[PDB]
Symmetry: C3
Subunit: 312 residues, 3 copies
């Protein structure tokens, strides 16, 4: 094979960062679409940690009539952070299957425990950077980055179950790609703190090649750094990825998404990847659910060396 990678796979069947049921079946859907076989065929040394079972929290209602399930979200992420830490500690590139995007709190925190100069490429229709004070929905899947960013620490209140989190990335160390549904406060956060982002509009103008070039220039232009790719399937157009809870029209094409993944592979710096927000229960047909899972597998496989030219 062109290159061998050691890859751990963690299922995180978690739904409480949002209100729509079924995203907890994300990890199963992706698995049934053949993830392990595909990574095997590419030369990957694989370790399957299986699908985690998160400790429920009995009482966990609306916090200040706004934040939904903070204790469950906080604890599930604390648990996931331990496993991701273990995997990275053991030397694996850590693939976590979601589950809603609240789980990036745990995956990035866990990763950061071993990589002080970690950087993040966040591929998403959404910035997910509302603080608990700026959120309109109160859904923590739209807040994960606020708890991780050092610059926002003074703006984030201490939520129950969240005391264990330490901000671990600076505003210069995360680049967003694919944005198209951004709240006014999130826009203010991005601009005010100099967080670099390439919205769908930036991609329309520059094209995905220049987007990736600039992305790497910003993050790894001066030195090599481990990369955490946090990939929300809703980055893709809903015609390609319909089985997801917060679809937004005018997303990435299949080609652009593969291009992102291929460029991440080509760095040789991919250290962890999240594939989140696949909700097969939201598909209007079996083939809608299966196409979304198949697309998830293509993203992950391309991140680990699958190409459009038979070079693997």
């Amino acid at each position: 094979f062109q290159s061998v990678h050691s890859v751990a796979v963690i299922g995180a069947p978690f739904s409480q960062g949002q209100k729509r049921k079924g995203v907890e079946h994300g990890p199963a859907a992706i698995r049934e679409a053949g993830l392990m076989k595909r990574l095997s065929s590419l030369g990957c040394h694989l370790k399957d940690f299986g699908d985690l079972s998160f400790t429920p929290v009995p009482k966990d209602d609306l916090y200040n009539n706004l934040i939904v399930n903070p204790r469950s979200v906080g604890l599930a992420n604390q648990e996931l952070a331990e496993v991701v830490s273990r995997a990275v500690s053991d030397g694996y590139s850590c693939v976590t299957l979601g589950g809603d995007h609240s789980l990036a709190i745990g995956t990035i925190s866990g990763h950061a425990r071993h990589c002080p100069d970690l950087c993040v490429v966040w591929v998403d229709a959404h910035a997910d950077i509302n603080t608990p004070l700026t959120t309109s929905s109160g859904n923590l899947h739209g807040q994960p980055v606020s708890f991780l960013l050092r610059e926002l620490q003074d703006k984030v209140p201490q939520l129950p179950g969240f005391s264990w989190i330490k901000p671990c990335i600076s505003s210069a160390s995360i680049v967003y790609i694919g944005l198209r549904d951004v709240d006014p406060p999130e826009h203010f956060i991005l601009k005010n703190y100099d967080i670099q982002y390439f919205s769908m509009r930036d991609i329309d103008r520059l094209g995905i090649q220049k987007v990736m070039e600039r992305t790497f220039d910003l993050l790894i232009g001066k030195r090599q750094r481990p990369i955490h790719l946090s990939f929300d399937i809703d980055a893709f157009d809903p015609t390609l990825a319909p089985a997801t809870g917060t679809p937004v029209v005018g997303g990435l094409t299949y080609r652009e998404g593969m291009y992102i993944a291929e460029e991440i592979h080509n760095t040789g710096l991919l250290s962890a990847l999240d594939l989140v927000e696949v909700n097969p229960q939201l598909a209007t047909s079996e083939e809608e659910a299966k196409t979304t899972a198949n697309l998830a597998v293509d993203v992950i496989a391309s991140s680990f060396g699958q190409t459009r030219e038979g070079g693997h």
Copy 2:
């Protein structure tokens, strides 16, 4: 903070396919007013105009009287909306309604320029049309340099040609009749076909469009936007669909660039025909797309940048 007037113009007699008169209602139902309200627009809804009801012309041109007259009535409403300080959004209805909207707009803004976003040039004369459908001719009646090639139709004498060939640019062209192509080339009318977009990219297409129309000075902009500019996969509920059109992204980009000028004075969103859809979702997606065009033309962004946001809350 835009003041926006919405006029329902249920034109159907510019073409032969029934249903297009329900376009203005389909768009309303898709939640147009809620969207423009969330954008901080000052809104006036004129409701749907009831035109006064009314023989073929040279055995070809159909219902021309009804079309000519309804356009005269439309043009007065647009004139007075513009006058009352509103940006004028006219919901269609077939594209023959542009005769009335551009005419009425050119009364108070003589220096207007036109961005025509369409699969079609709609510049056949009453003598070059094969179909006889007036939705395929509106630009011939409006264009100054073309007057001696256009005969006087019953109901159309009121129309004073108000735009020169250098003040209209087309974007999206892919189904242009031979006489149309002749007109485009011989009158030096600038256009960016699908093929020009494939070469240049929509960013460059918009830069060059504005260079041509407002390169010398700021001017009021009239955006005449036919939903069939978009690929039929995206906008299937429409009468003359043509494969290989704009993507969702390209169309939002045009609207956004139009907004970013701060010059948009009037906008037509034409040719949504809910009855031509093969299902209720196809009908609804077409109307949702129409809303997205209008909202982006007035400030909706892909970046959350529509409102001013000054200060983060503190747990302080």
Copy 3:
């Protein structure tokens, strides 16, 4: 219409090969494309037309299926194409599976030894009889044609008539996205130039066509052979085909390729292959694929998005 920007002489041959692969139905490609109104469309573009109509075995090494039927059918097809081209026609062949390019290219080369090939396809179809995993000859045609690969290619039954006729420098691929590892090796090792979908994502279709022509006709005008597999298009656009691969050309990119081919004035033969109406799930899927096939062929002979191919004389006056 009396007046056109250009007038082409075009021969049409139906070549319903199905034996270069295993799925039934592709032999109905030529009928599907004719029923989508191909002849009418070409007439409307001012072409002089000659319609040649539609033309009408043990495993090799326990793998390669139908070598004699395929090798021999291609010998016959080669004759028809050579005749058409010799008589001054740009020769359009409707497939049928892609194994037919063995015949069309070999025949074309008899009269046009200096031809170049633009191969538009999800696949490189450059497996040898020794590297192929499927045994399907439609995945092997380029290996028979290429000079530099002759010593890597064994003599098959039905194939003694074929002389390799193109050098590795005279073929450029566009659209590649499903390349077997031994195919990747050949491409790199013989320095065959290709624009994969990834290359199109980076350069854009305009620069891909510019660079393609710089590679092939940059030094001198040469007859162009366009071998165009419908599966180069995204399966959402061309679902009716045997080996569909996600992430393909858009409608606009495909038409752009054909328009630029037309603009060279050098198009000398064109294959339009792999349309299999039976693999559609609906009549609209089948007809869309056939209509797209017609749009490709039409656009190769002057159909454009802007409507300048028919020449208009003067506007009537009232």
